[PDB]
Design a binder for this molecule. Sequence first.
Ligand SMILES: N[C@@H](Cn1oc(=O)[nH]c1=O)C(=O)O
Ligand SMILES: N[C@@H](Cn1oc(=O)[nH]c1=O)C(=O)O
Ligand SMILES: [Zn+2]
Ligand SMILES: [Zn+2]
Lengths: 258, 258
Amino acid sequence: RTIVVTTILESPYVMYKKNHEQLEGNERYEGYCVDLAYEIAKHVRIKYKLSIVGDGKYGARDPETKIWNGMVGELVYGRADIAVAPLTITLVREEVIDFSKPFMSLGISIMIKKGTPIESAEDLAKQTEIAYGTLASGSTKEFFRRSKIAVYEKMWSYMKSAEPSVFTKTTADGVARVRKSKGKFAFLLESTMNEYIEQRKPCDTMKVGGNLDSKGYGVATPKGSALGNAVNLAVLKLNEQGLLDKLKNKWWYDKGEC
Amino acid sequence: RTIVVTTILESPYVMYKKNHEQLEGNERYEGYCVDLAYEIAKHVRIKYKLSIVGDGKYGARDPETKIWNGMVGELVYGRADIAVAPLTITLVREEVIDFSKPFMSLGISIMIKKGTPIESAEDLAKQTEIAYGTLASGSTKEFFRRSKIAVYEKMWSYMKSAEPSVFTKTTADGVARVRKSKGKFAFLLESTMNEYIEQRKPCDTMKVGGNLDSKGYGVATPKGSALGNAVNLAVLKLNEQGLLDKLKNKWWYDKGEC
Ligand SMILES: N[C@@H](Cn1oc(=O)[nH]c1=O)C(=O)O
Ligand SMILES: N[C@@H](Cn1oc(=O)[nH]c1=O)C(=O)O
Ligand SMILES: [Zn+2]
Ligand SMILES: [Zn+2]
């Protein structure tokens, strides 16, 4: 009766509340996806427990082992009933899980330390002074790996062979690396995360240039799950009511710091 | 064996080629959705015939008669197998037809004649000198009708009661009305159409302010159609390959005039 909602600690989607160590269950967490899960469960009429994905990954398939990890794996192997997270709708995932229509639109983007002389991916690719990387095990990395577009192929060739690694285990690690690198590291990550960090102290980063692609996050459910239809209608309803907009403003901009 | 693809004459999605009167079948037409249909049919492996929707409507349900019109109706009553058009994914449509993940992201937007002293929906709502309207029978009208947000309720109250009508039968009619009204008419329409017209002679219109919402166009198929899954994967593939981007540039910007 209580459905398991897998998610991921990623600001400002899911974050520990100030005094989380004193709290239990869903009360431990707050953020955009916490509010979204709440609103969805209200419309779908279900009780639910939030579960931070053990491996802290979004979801990729190991090419030799064929096993899916991350939140995707939790749905594929039946350990979670739904994923409410900034989980990018991609072809390879759509082949193994279902997704609602997007609750958020976004694109890959470039984060720089303010003052870094970079305005575009083309700028990054043609030089080697400033290092650059992506999150490991996610859709941004796969974008570069899979691209057949010259600029992105070049970037991927550089990143894949870079030493030390330019692939971070979390978004937060990549941001920290941008902040501490005195302008010699730039981070490729989704515009949503980039825009959020731009609004937080110490206000030393910025998104530059246009997004590299155009895509969406969806609420995910096991292939053929009978929760799928209701979750999809719920997302559409929440969008048309203006609630998704309200939540984005709430967690990104209303308390912006920059 | 030959599937019927319903669509709509809407620039630059589907347009008559220069010498269409001399041509037959699919060759009569060109545009973004013509190219998209082609690419999709290639991936799904089907032969197809484009069919301009007889009533020239997107799709709404008559509240008394309960009948769906437009492209939606063509799918609901089994007269078309697929819709490849700028057809907005909405809750009420999702209840009766299926949609692919979005092939284009967009939002409601304001078109003005250059120089019109309007920058936002708030600007429109608080005054009566400049008239404003939407397409009849589409998702933009429904947005206003359905909103519970003060500014939009006010706008809807004004539009619903305005005399003469501010509701146009086509996008093209609303644009023409903006162009001929010396700044005394503004048109509410999707950002995609607005951005296209901004790039066409006589370059006398512009999009102003932010979009009012955030949504998408999907390729549509009858509820439970066995074409649905392949069409959805096809759209995702075309997006991830950069083809959708390439087509948007092709039909909007590559030959921009302004
Ligand atoms: N939403 C992404 C995870 N990730 O977040 C970023 O900012 N880049 C990236 O790959 C996914 O679902 O894989
Ligand atoms: N895509 C819209 C049709 N329409 O185009 C606009 O620009 N506004 C509007 O309502 C629909 O599917 O109803
Ligand atoms: Zn803590
Ligand atoms: Zn003609």
